[PDB]
């Protein structure tokens, strides 16, 4: 306070903020390849679905819509990319 680097804010105090009040704004959601080992292939899901994402071939389920982040269902794995 009184003199600080507004141009190079620290990654943490930057990280804790709001998605619009960061330096330059950008999302804080993410995508993921997801597999329920009944099948073999990997469907790409949105961390904040809304739509209860219907799996590829087997209409099994996958995730459920929520407040924000989707709840993935039962026995499933992932990765953020």
């Amino acid at each position: 306070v009184l003199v600080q680097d507004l141009l190079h804010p620290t990654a943490a105090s930057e990280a804790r903020k709001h998605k619009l009040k960061t330096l330059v704004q950008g999302p804080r959601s993410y995508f993921l390849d997801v597999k329920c080992p009944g099948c073999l292939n990997i469907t790409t899901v949105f961390s904040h679905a809304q739509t209860a994402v219907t799996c590829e071939s087997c209409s099994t389920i996958l995730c459920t819509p929520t407040g924000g982040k989707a709840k993935l269902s039962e026995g499933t794995s992932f990765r953020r990319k």
Binding site: L2, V3, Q4, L6, L7, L23, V24, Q25
Partner: protein
């Protein structure tokens, strides 16, 4: 709704100075803010500044020295008539030996003294001292 993007940057700058800060971050920048920002800096009322680039309208960080008591904005951009530029400075500048009334003329955003030397006039928007 946001009404004069100049007004906000200017006031920010002033509130910072007043509270003893050295930097503002202003939002959302424009051609005009820069040109205004540039004019103050030319006579040293602020340090350097940086345009950061949100893929939007922009942000600006200004560095303040402390040499600045006031930078105001003239809210309706009145026409001034080369004769009437005198009447403005008189109204709202501390003395005749320093401070500038800045204004937008056909041939560029410029403080009144430059405007005098170049023999152009136009609309008025703000001031520094």
């Amino acid at each position: 709704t946001r009404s004069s993007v100049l007004a906000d940057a200017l006031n920010a700058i002033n509130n910072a100075e007043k509270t003893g800060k050295r930097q503002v971050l202003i939002r959302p920048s424009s051609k005009v803010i820069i040109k205004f920002l540039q004019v103050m800096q030319k006579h040293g009322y602020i340090g350097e500044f940086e345009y950061i680039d949100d893929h939007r309208s922009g942000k600006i960080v200004v560095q303040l020295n402390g040499r600045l008591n006031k930078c105001g904005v003239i809210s309706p951009r009145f026409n001034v008539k080369i004769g009437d530029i005198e009447k403005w400075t008189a109204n709202l500048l501390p003395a005749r030996q320093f401070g500038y009334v800045i204004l937008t003329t056909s041939a560029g955003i410029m403080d009144h003294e430059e405007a005098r030397r170049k023999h152009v006039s136009g609309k008025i928007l703000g001031f520094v001292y």
